[PDB]
């Protein structure tokens, strides 16, 4: 019942914390990979085309992918890449934290 | 009137990607008012103490910047939440 769900949730969150790798010891590439850039652009374009608040100033453009590229140029994309290690461990890099090319 | 703490799994809209608390409230919690629920066991008379869980476990719970997991094929985000419901 409620307590069974409580212990299930506790086990799930404990496993999640045991899998997360803290910011002070991640050993992945500092750069943003091409796949990461493409998916971050696609997801940000989806979000803005779904009537999300925007930060950069529109120059009359109406292509959501172009607006997402403008945001990536201005480093205004509020997204996090969760790079998954083979065993399930994950490092949460930020878009601004990564260096594009 | 019994206070029943529950854990939700709700969707977050890109329109509400800037005030996720009010987004979750208006998407899910506000409809539940004055409507009987097949899970809790009574008509919900209100809510309070809505706290959104974090997709990053190492983040301190006192922080104000939490992570929501975006659907791979949709700009919507799904996250776990905790909230107390006033149930009659």
């Amino acid at each position: 019942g409620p307590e069974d769900f409580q212990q299930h949730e506790q086990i799930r969150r404990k496993t999640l914390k045991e899998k997360a790798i803290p910011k002070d010891q991640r050993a992945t590439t500092p750069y943003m990979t091409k796949y990461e850039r493409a998916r971050i652009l696609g997801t940000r374009a989806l979000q803005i085309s779904m009537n999300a608040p925007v930060f950069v100033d529109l120059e009359g453009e109406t292509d959501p992918l172009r607006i997402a590229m403008k945001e990536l140029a201005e480093k205004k994309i509020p997204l996090v890449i969760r790079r998954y290690l083979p065993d399930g461990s994950f490092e949460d890099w930020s878009v601004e934290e990564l260096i594009v090319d | 009137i019994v206070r029943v703490p529950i854990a939700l799994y709700v969707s977050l809209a890109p329109m509400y990607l800037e005030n996720p608390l009010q987004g979750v409230m208006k998407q899910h919690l506000n409809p539940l008012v004055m409507k009987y629920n097949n899970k809790v066991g009574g008509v919900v008379l209100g809510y309070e103490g809505l706290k959104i869980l974090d997709a990053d476990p190492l983040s301190k719970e006192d922080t104000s910047e939490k992570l929501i997991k975006i659907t791979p094929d949709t700009p919507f985000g799904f996250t776990w939440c905790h909230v107390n419901l006033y149930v009659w």
């Binding site: 409580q6 | 029943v4 703490p5 854990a7 799994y9 969707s11 899910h28 409809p31 899970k39």
Partner: peptide, 18 residues
Amino acid sequence: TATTLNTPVVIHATQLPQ
């Protein structure tokens, strides 16, 4: 209705009604 936009995916009781 009943899309994943008005109703939660799962409602789980955290603890007994208190």
